[PDB]
Amino acid sequence: RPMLQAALENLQAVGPAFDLDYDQNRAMLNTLNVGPTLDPRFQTYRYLRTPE
Amino acid sequence: VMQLASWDTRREFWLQTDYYKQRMVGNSKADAALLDEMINNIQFIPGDFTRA
Numbered sequence: 001r002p003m004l005q006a007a008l009e010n011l012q013a014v015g016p017a018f019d020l021d022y023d024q025n026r027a028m029l030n031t032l033n034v035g036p037t038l039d040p041r042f043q044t045y046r047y048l049r050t051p052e
Numbered sequence: 053v054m055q056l057a058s059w060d061t062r063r064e065f066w067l068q069t070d071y072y073k074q075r076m077v078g079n080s081k082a083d084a085a086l087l088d089e090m091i092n093n094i095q096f097i098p099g100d101f102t103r104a
Contacts, residue, residue, distance in 0.1 A: 048060060
């Protein structure tokens with residue numbers, strides 16, 4: 001009887017058990033919440049014959 | 053190969069050679085006509101691996 005009551009109390013105060021895969025996703029989600037950094041005015045070509 | 057056939061590369065080469073500098077008469081319009089003639093004096097012919 002008594003330690004069985006103890007088991008209920010201990011598991012109640014700990015909560016659900018999580019694996020490693022859960023923790024990795026949370027760390028990745030933090031970076032995604034920051035958001036991308038946008039810098040305009042970057043070239044999208046290069047010259048092989050400049051106009052003259 | 054890309055730099056060999058480039059119109060830009062041929063233009064920078066002639067401007068730093070003594071062969072071209074002694075042929076400048078001093079008129080801005082004449083020199084530009086002379087320089088454009090020299091650019092066409094270099095020809096690049098791509099090859100074929102099928103015919104070796």
